[model samples]
Target: TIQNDIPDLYSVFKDYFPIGVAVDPSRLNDADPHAQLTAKHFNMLVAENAMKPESLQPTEGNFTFDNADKIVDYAIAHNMKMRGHTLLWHNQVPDWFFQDPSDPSKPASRDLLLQRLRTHITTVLDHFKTKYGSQNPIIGWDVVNAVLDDNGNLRNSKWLQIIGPDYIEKAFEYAHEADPSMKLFINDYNIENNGVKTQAMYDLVKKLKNEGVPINGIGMQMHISINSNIDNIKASIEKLASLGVEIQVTELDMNMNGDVSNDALLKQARLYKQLFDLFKAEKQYITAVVFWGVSDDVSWLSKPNAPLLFDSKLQAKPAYWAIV
Candidate 1:
């Protein structure tokens, strides 16, 4: 078991870069051994769902803080670095968020949509300030996520249908206004393998940086399979690094299908090793590597999928050693 004999993961990689994990509310309890494991192995914690728009503001003018605040407080108390999982994302946004308050069914006007967005960001940031004060350990946030598709085109989300492409710029601007010190990021998946999508991301961030959009980083949601090409992943990192922005391996996990054999597990371990080696080589630009979940039991993906480094029994798998 990790707690019994293995060297602490964060300690092993402390000299190289920060290691992080996504944490669910249930895992915050001190009685839960995983909570102790989290503080021991990771330097950073990203609230898996509690901080998302749907979870934070489930209804108009009503904000939920108990779940998220507990997680943030846990991080602060442990002296762990923190990263906000997301501030703006098309999916999981509240229905009331895009609808006119007077008519829940009708899509909000462009002006109303922008106003709602601003209010949501401001309120969320303000809550953090009130609780944790100005110099909170939440060093960065995924300001916007999955706004582009694999074809290198802007995803025609409800935000775009109403607010246009400038919605991206506005989201970043709103986040900056809420807290200038928090590093803002545009996060997306599939950019590592999809060439067209990678190019589009690079172009968009370059344009945003050139226009002084207060953007500071890019997050590659490294949700990959065991067979993902290491070379392509390295190239993608270099391409983003060329933009002179910090890079984060956010939500990293290697998925495997049914009938996990020893050979399959070894393959996954090797892949993790190769990827971590690349991260170490580019440590200057690559700031953090965050696993998507603490253990396979609580992962969103179905089993027999072993995507994370820890097993259901709180044991570190072969993949854990690959990074250390």
Candidate 2:
């Protein structure tokens, strides 16, 4: 299944940084096509959803690592590093985390909520720490995700309501205590440009650094379209770099206008090249550039939108060539 003629993305960027691709564990089974594609081209793996709180502990206090283990096992066996997707997010969390166990109608108290958060983060990290031992594959964790909105303010998440603003700091602290070596990241989308949201994220990072929070990286979920700004992206990267934290281009993908014509494809290719050019230029602060999907056939976006480098047939497209 290894496409010998197609250049491997990892090798091309090995000197610069690791190349990561997010995926569902089912897609990496031995009989699956994506198995070869991931093993050959990418050097890092992140679960698309399997590591979320809802997936890990669906019933609360009952942590299920089976699906996530499949992904971790694949990465270890393939010599690819893994990324712990998230410890905290407003979405994909169990109701039990927010609601009182006995009084389902009422929100849980701050102490109860903090205990749950601490328990969840510690338990999850300990599982991998104990299992992997000396060969732990995960190099970083998206400790907090999408907490900021477009208005440059914290979203009205249950965590915010229950635990207040310091919850973000407490999360990284818990993760750091669980595994000191693990790089911690705060991740969000729409922060790839010089905007209010971008400034909010930068200030958050800067504030965390001032307090000596274990904020190792900033995850820029660069889910851009063909018309997205390149110059602004560069400026945001520079602006964030001032805080002296690693910048990971997480969830990198480009959307087309559903036009697969040569001109449209060429335009997409140009954008990819331009983005990679910026990524390479800022490689000092940029550590990894992870695509949101392995192939267009399986992107979270619409299939016809063609938002990935590999086409449905697992062939490298013009966009892949443009960057390489």
Candidate 3:
């Protein structure tokens, strides 16, 4: 009955499904019934290795689309909108991309690496757009991620480590040119306040918008805690929206101890209700709210922290009922 009732959350899902879940493509074949049930409910899926370098590496000097093509094919068949996890990030890059082609262990010089970077982005975008452009396959893509530190100062990402700060601008420019139709986004976490990192992200978005970058949106990876500063979070969203960037609550989940107190659980519901109410009242800029996962048991936060609308028993927590 709870599973049946969960559809109530969709009532406020806006014109777009707005609400989505991330699934490991391999897990679609799980023996677990919950996984199957989840697939039926969520309308969008983001592939894991969409941004990883291994997914791009090939002997032909061009990117391969085998794994990502599987995701695209599945999403297209189901008519589900898909978000590409990332194009550039500091982590999960293949050894070869960071190194010489002849010797995977040897790092390449900066000048030589810039050539590789251009080649990689162009090749990947060309093939993806060509394959999916038939039906306009993937929806929004994370053009860049995790580049700004908490204070918003540009961090020394591997991309930066190679060519410098301009690499971020280059990544977005290349992505924009690659697929002008798809929604190109700059995504990051912990921008729920006026901290250094948050400020930097806002600055970057503003700069990009002014420069006529085809940037369409900003994603706040709302990895909030039980005791989060809601007012600050709301303010941050308002500020980002003022800059004319479509704001999305991406990878959103409130982390808490599994053994949460009754008052804390109530607080969780209240917070969610307020958030939805705010979205309802101010729907101008906020486009979507994508939860990180479904059940606490299966969540990446379960070990470090409990975070989900459902417990391991598949029972809706008070927070779930509150939001619905």
Candidate 4:
């Protein structure tokens, strides 16, 4: 269980870089044991869902912030570095973003869709900046997430269908216009492989850079299993490093898939150690390595999946020691 004292994970890697974790704001309370472990082990916090577009504004004109603000204020009070989970994503966006507010059944036009997107982006960023002040811990945002599919092609999301391919650039532009200094990132899953997906990501990033887009980082959602190829990850990192942008291993977790035996656990630990070594070797290009959940209990993929640093009891697991 999380005690008052432990060899802090964040401090262990303090010289290498900041350690980060994402959690639901409800689980981030000061009174919660999970929250204590989070504050102790991590120097940075990413709200798992609070900052998502649907959470911020579920209804067309009914924008809400109290839930998301809990995360913001918690990070601010804890002096933990902050990174916005996302501003635009194919999933989790409210229906109002694609449907006409009044009719709800009619499809939105490109102009209408873009206008709504622009409003959401500006409104959210402006509110955060003004309320938190200029010195807040938030460093940047994952401006757009998971746009590319496993086939290394743009996913056929509503944003693409309505606004066409340029919607990605437009999304980043709106965020940059609202917050000139905010580091923008392109976040995706399955791009950790050295195959077509990574090549696709590399090409897209190269295009963004060539066109002078304000993209500043690449986020690889390292959702891995024991069977994952570490060499592929190394090659993917090396390939993206050529793009000259910061890299983040956002949403990291490795599941043992219902096998929690000693051998499986130890295998998971060794893989974690190997991954961190790679991160350390490439420290120059990497910025932050954020775990998807603080504890296995609260993770989206819980227990049988068992893919985090701490167990359901909040005790540090072998994976914790492996990294430290």
TM-score of each: 0.97, 0.98, 0.87, 0.97
lDDT over C-alpha atoms for residue 219 of model 2: 95
Model 2: ten consecutive residues of lowest lDDT: 1-10
**lDDT for each candidate structure:** 0.87, 0.90, 0.71, 0.89
Model 4, range 110-220, lDDT digits (tens) per residue?
Answer: 999989989999998988898887756778899999999889999989999988998999989999999987889999988888889999999999998899888999999
- Name the 10 consecutive residues with the lowest summed lDDT in model 3: 1-10
- Which residue pairs show collisions in model 1? none
Per-residue C-alpha lDDT of model 1 across residues 5-60, encoded as one tens digit per residue = 67878787787788999999888787788887788888998998999999998988
Count: clashes, candidate 2: 0
Per-residue lDDT, model 2, residue 311, is 82
Candidate 1 vs candidate 2: which has greater lDDT? Answer: 2
Write candidate 3's Cα lDDT for 36-129 as tens digits: 5455556666665644556666443756677777767766775667777777777766656667767766777677766776677677777777
The candidate maximizing lDDT is 2
Q: What are the clashing pairs of model 2? A: none
Model 2 per-residue lDDT tens digits across residues 1-324 = 446677889898987999999989889877788888888899999999999999999997788999999999999999988888999999999889999999899999988999999999999999999998878899989999999988989998999999899999999999999999899999999998799999999998898889989999999999999889999999999998899899999999888867777788889999999999889888899998899989888899875778888887888889999988
Error of 1 at 2 (Å): 4.8
